[PDB]
């Protein structure tokens, strides 16, 4: 029911990345954000894959392109939403997942930087970091990834996808 866009870091080029961000940007809403909108057109799904054969699905808000949460295998993780409407809305994402978590924090930079123990500007971006970020997000579902590395991997995703589509 939600639009899915694919991207892989395996054999990734400047073109494939640019086309990917173009595809994401082409789904962002431009009409004045109404309230009580159809739930089916509130979110876009970004299915990320890497060399390591791992795969995760990010959930992006159509209004601002920001990550509201993600799916890794049979588990789903959401940032704490800001309001009741957003809270109710995210209960319609990844609804058949058995393991379901809402973090005790929102997905904003100040918080993610505090968690990663570093600032945005110092966090190396690129295809190589996004490779590692995708694994880190995946292996979080199996207890492998620690919270600072997770928080760091979110920043890489948000900057390379959300920020990249936003301008």
């Amino acid at each position, epitope marked *: 029911q939600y639009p899915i866009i694919n991207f892989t870091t395996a054999g990734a080029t400047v073109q494939s990345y640019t086309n990917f961000i173009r595809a994401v940007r082409g789904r962002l809403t431009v009409l004045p954000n109404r309230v009580g909108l159809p739930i089916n057109q509130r979110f876009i799904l970004v299915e990320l894959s890497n060399h390591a054969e791992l795969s995760v699905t990010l959930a992006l808000d159509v209004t601002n392109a920001y990550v509201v949460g993600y799916r890794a295998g049979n588990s789903a993780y959401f940032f*704490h*939403p800001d*309001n*009741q409407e957003d*809270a109710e809305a995210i*209960t319609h994402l990844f609804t058949d997942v*058995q*393991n*379901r*978590y*809402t*973090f*005790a924090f929102g997905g904003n930079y100040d918080r993610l930087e505090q968690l990663a123990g570093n600032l945005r500007e110092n966090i190396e971006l690129g295809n190589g970091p996004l490779e590692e970020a995708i694994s880190a997000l995946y292996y979080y579902s199996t207890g492998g990834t620690q*919270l600072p590395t997770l928080a760091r991997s979110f920043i890489i995703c948000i900057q390379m996808i959300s920020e990249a589509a936003r301008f």
Partner: nanobody
Amino acid sequence: EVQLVESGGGLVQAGDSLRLSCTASGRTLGDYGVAWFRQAPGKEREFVSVISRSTIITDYADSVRGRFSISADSAKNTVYLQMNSLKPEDTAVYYCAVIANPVYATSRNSDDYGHWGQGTQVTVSS
């Protein structure tokens, strides 16, 4: 120091309503995320419902959605579970617990919870 006690359980008929109470002593319950779990005869401990400390996130198991309703009352230091349209499949011992893993506001995994109560028994007959 927190101590959780479940009450409200008993014998009912199918289609009936029932309201459970997770009462706390030792600390304020409004300072926790509170979940209900249950264990039916011959079955594993099952996630049922959770309410976040912030009170805006709730979550339910698929088998209880539309039927069960979680809510909190700090006036009494209690978290409720309204159970409607009860069926024999709901027969179980109902436990409540506090979310003990500070990374999550809500979880369906029992490992993320601590300070489990004794449990209150709910039996739905047909």
